């Protein structure tokens, strides 16, 4: 049984300001969650809130600690589905819902003498993550891409969305100096339907291939996502448009996207498991991403990816661009690779 | 890791012939599955094949024992997702796929020191099953219904499909002597779309309410299922039309049914989990059924039901119609109630 639930503010500074369409941050403010069982076992999770995507504010998450304690204290973690149903009511605090649910499995796995990934199926022993190139001058972008490549990463994520002409130029220049790497382009809702299509065609015409083209249009523009999917050569993904399992069922029914970028910070463990199943029962493919998690937080996604083995691509690099005193994940980080202990 | 797998034929005779639309059985010939782990732990499962529903034949199942052994031995049950993916290739032997996948969870849970229901969420501690009234003269049906009612069952499943007029009379007569009970009507594909509608309207006009109206039309008639749903007052369920997670995605997309009767013998654990997630992500509701499982076989569905807690109704009574010396389920059977140990 759970006897205590602790929420605490943890700040992590980025080695350099991270710039994406309509957003710039140089710090990551998360909420660490610790669940304590009567047996003494302690499970840990981390919420990396997003005002832009989930409408959350870190001050608001911290303010509801007492409410969270009242919601699940006294419940046995072996009845984790009950804890999941209850925490699903925190749909307005997605990142916290995610942290609490993972900390629950973390505690439960310890009690069963195993790990979260195995509890989830233990499908894979290793996964590889890409690394992101934020928005900057074409020169700086090429410089960072070149450095990431030298670091061993074979999948480079490129942010775009604020300047179509320069975005195209940037992607073309990056491709030159990183031959052999796969590319994921993320526009974070910055383009109109037509611009998005133009972007993809321009790049395509230069012989460049994009493995995944992330959320090119606004979140409510489901038809726009479909339009881009049906009128451009690269696989299109929903990110901001895919937060819950209901959003995904709708995206599938509408045949709007080739991919859904799952993020525990958007869906929590409960909806993420539903999305995995929905994708495996349809033509949908998945990738897993992150917000601003530290190593403790990314640990949640690593165990989820390793356990379900449901992703074609993994974008779990937020902890790689953060100055963090010490590693706190329950996994092994070896360059672009992440493995089970 | 699994060091061996054994398949064994096991027969159970019914107290009386069980008559459903286009089928009469006097015995249940199942295949018991035993998995042996290097640790010495042994997991058990039971396959109750269906020629009519799955196209399976008990002799064919026993014939591929060596193939199954070669498929899973050498795999650690903690990597059960790998076992699930491999056994998914046995789509032509669904009942066997189910037995093996459950035996896997049965072995894993023992190793972890818990039960299968908790592994799946531990959502509920108790569930209630209905009891079925097979096709017979109206007189015998009424007699059996009253007996089932006196035994404490409050959800009575009634088989119909071969004689519309008599079927209506049978339900009307059963309702009169079982005031307080809910009814599930199963036509096992015996009616045309229009007869299915007329059956429901007639029962409705007499003031009788049907909780679930199971598979009124032929299995390939998806539009027929939808037609009955949109033109009849009771919730319509797909059984024979819903075998895989892909069948269910299609049923949802087409809004063909209100319910899906999940059977491990049709879907196995893997697809059943996917179906539960699809239902919770949509307007679909679920019930869980059985084929001809003995107590060891029903145990599989009891743990799935208790753990996920995803079902509105439970039709797990096949073991109550069989003659069996020793109870072999890992659950407590108290009248219509089934509880975790
Ligand atoms: Mg994204
Ligand atoms: Mg049925």
């Amino acid at each position: 049984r759970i006897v205590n639930v602790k929420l605490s503010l943890k700040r992590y500074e980025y080695e350099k300001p991270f710039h994406i369409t309509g957003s710039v941050s140089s710090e990551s403010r998360n909420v660490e969650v610790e669940i304590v069982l009567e047996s003494g076992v302690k499970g840990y999770g981390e919420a990396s809130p997003s005002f832009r995507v989930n409408g959350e504010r870190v001050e608001a998450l911290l303010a509801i600690e007492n409410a969270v304690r009242e919601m699940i204290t006294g419940i046995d973690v072996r009845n984790y589905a009950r804890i999941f149903e209850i925490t699903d009511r925190l749909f307005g605090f997605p990142s916290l819902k995610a942290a609490v649910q993972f900390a629950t499995l973390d505690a439960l796995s310890q009690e069963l003498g195993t790990q979260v990934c195995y509890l989830l199926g233990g499908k894979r022993d290793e996964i590889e993550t890409d690394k992101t190139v934020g928005i900057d001058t074409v020169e700086n972008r090429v410089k960072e891409a070149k450095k990431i490549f030298e670091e061993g990463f074979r999948v480079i994520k490129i942010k775009v969305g604020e300047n179509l002409k320069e975005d195209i130029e940037a992607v073309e220049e990056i491709a030159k100096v990183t031959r052999g790497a796969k590319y994921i382009v993320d526009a974070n809702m910055g383009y109109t339907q037509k611009e998005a299509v133009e972007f993809a065609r321009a790049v395509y015409q230069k012989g460049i291939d994009i493995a995944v083209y992330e959320q090119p249009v606004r979140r409510e523009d489901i038809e726009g996502l479909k339009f881009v999917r049906f009128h451009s050569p690269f696989p299109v993904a929903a990110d901001e448009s895919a937060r819950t399992k209901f959003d995904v069922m709708r995206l599938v029914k509408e045949e709007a996207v080739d991919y859904v970028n799952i993020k525990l910070m958007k869906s929590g463990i409960s909806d993420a498991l539903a999305i995995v199943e929905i994708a495996e029962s349809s033509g949908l493919k998945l990738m897993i991403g992150c917000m601003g998690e530290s190593s403790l937080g990314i640990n949640q996604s690593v165990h989820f990816a390793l356990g379900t083995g449901a992703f074609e691509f993994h974008d779990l690099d937020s902890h790689l661009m953060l100055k963090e005193e010490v590693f706190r994940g329950k996994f092994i980080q070896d360059g672009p690779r992440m493995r089970v202990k």
Side-chain angles (χ1 to χ4, degrees), chain A residues 26-85:
Chain A
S26 56
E27 186 178 57
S28 188
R29 317 250 304 310
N30 304 333
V31 177
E32 179 166 307
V33 173
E34 173 184 355
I35 289 186
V36 187
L37 276 36
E38 61 190 329
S39 73
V41 171
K42 300 172 179 177
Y44 295 78
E46 179 187 60
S48 180
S50 175
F51 181 60
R52 185 182 54 98
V53 179
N54 304 319
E56 307 167 290
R57 309 282 303 176
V58 62
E59 316 86 71
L61 272 64
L62 294 168
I64 69 168
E65 175 178 302
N66 190 253
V68 177
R69 282 178 174 173
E70 288 176 352
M71 288 170 90
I72 65 177
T73 58
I75 302 181
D76 198 304
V77 290
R78 68 179 189 172
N79 298 298
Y80 73 83
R82 291 173 200 170
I83 291 173
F84 279 22
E85 181 174 59

Side-chain angles (χ1 to χ4, degrees), chain A residues 110-124:
Chain A
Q110 290 177 68
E111 298 214 302
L112 296 176
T114 188
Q115 302 189 57
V116 180
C117 55
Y118 297 125
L119 227 48
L120 296 177
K123 199 159 193 171
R124 299 175 59 172

Side-chain angles (χ1 to χ4, degrees), chain A residues 157-183:
Chain A
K157 178 163 179 174
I158 306 176
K159 290 286 177 178
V160 310
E162 287 179 354
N163 189 313
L164 177 62
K165 190 185 301 303
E166 178 181 343
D167 290 327
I168 291 169
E169 182 59 47
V171 172
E172 283 166 351
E173 290 306 308
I174 289 178
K176 293 175 175 297
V177 304
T178 55
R179 191 181 57 182
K182 297 290 197 59
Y183 311 111

Side-chain angles (χ1 to χ4, degrees), chain A residues 83-95:
Chain A
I83 291 173
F84 279 22
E85 181 174 59
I86 294 174
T87 51
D88 277 337
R89 291 165 195 157
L90 298 172
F91 67 85
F93 302 81
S95 61

Side-chain angles (χ1 to χ4, degrees), chain A residues 227-241:
Chain A
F227 192 87
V228 178
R229 183 194 182 190
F230 282 69
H231 300 274
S232 58
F234 309 123
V236 174
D239 180 344
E240 287 90 336
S241 294

Side-chain angles (χ1 to χ4, degrees), chain A residues 41-285:
Chain A
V41 171
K42 300 172 179 177
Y44 295 78
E46 179 187 60
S48 180
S50 175
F51 181 60
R52 185 182 54 98
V53 179
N54 304 319
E56 307 167 290
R57 309 282 303 176
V58 62
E59 316 86 71
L61 272 64
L62 294 168
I64 69 168
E65 175 178 302
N66 190 253
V68 177
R69 282 178 174 173
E70 288 176 352
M71 288 170 90
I72 65 177
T73 58
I75 302 181
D76 198 304
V77 290
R78 68 179 189 172
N79 298 298
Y80 73 83
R82 291 173 200 170
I83 291 173
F84 279 22
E85 181 174 59
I86 294 174
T87 51
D88 277 337
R89 291 165 195 157
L90 298 172
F91 67 85
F93 302 81
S95 61
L96 184 55
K97 164 193 171 185
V100 172
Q101 298 186 339
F102 185 84
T104 291
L105 297 183
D106 183 36
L108 169 58
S109 62
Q110 290 177 68
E111 298 214 302
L112 296 176
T114 188
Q115 302 189 57
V116 180
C117 55
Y118 297 125
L119 227 48
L120 296 177
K123 199 159 193 171
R124 299 175 59 172
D125 292 319
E126 175 183 297
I127 58 173
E128 191 176 308
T129 175
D130 58 31
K131 195 161 181 180
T132 304
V133 173
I135 293 175
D136 202 322
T137 68
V138 179
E139 193 176 70
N140 288 172
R141 285 160 138 172
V142 173
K143 178 62 190 66
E144 175 165 57
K146 201 173 296 187
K147 181 186 177 186
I148 289 172
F149 191 65
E150 181 170 302
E151 285 167 42
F153 293 96
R154 264 30 188 177
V155 180
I156 303 179
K157 178 163 179 174
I158 306 176
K159 290 286 177 178
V160 310
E162 287 179 354
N163 189 313
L164 177 62
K165 190 185 301 303
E166 178 181 343
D167 290 327
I168 291 169
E169 182 59 47
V171 172
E172 283 166 351
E173 290 306 308
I174 289 178
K176 293 175 175 297
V177 304
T178 55
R179 191 181 57 182
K182 297 290 197 59
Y183 311 111
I184 287 176
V185 171
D186 190 349
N188 285 111
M189 313 181 281
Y191 300 150
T192 60
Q193 289 178 32
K194 301 293 191 173
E195 301 182 321
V197 171
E198 175 46 49
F199 171 85
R201 292 185 175 175
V203 171
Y204 176 83
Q205 281 305 305
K206 287 55 171 181
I208 300 172
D209 185 54
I210 298 175
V212 184
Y213 186 18
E214 270 186 272
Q215 191 80 41
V217 300
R218 300 222 304 178
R219 84 188 71 194
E220 299 288 351
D221 201 11
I222 300 306
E223 310 184 323
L225 283 172
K226 184 171 179 176
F227 192 87
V228 178
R229 183 194 182 190
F230 282 69
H231 300 274
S232 58
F234 309 123
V236 174
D239 180 344
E240 287 90 336
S241 294
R243 296 168 58 194
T244 72
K245 55 191 180 188
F246 298 104
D247 294 327
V248 177
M249 276 299 300
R250 173 175 286 101
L251 290 165
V252 166
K253 294 177 179 174
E254 318 238 63
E255 312 176 7
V257 298
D258 304 288
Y259 274 84
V260 155
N261 175 347
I262 294 188
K263 288 185 190 185
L264 301 178
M265 291 310 106
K266 287 183 296 168
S267 309
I269 302 300
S270 51
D271 286 57
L273 288 170
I275 293 167
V276 164
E277 296 291 23
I278 292 169
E280 305 186 325
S281 304
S282 61
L284 187 61
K285 283 194 291 296

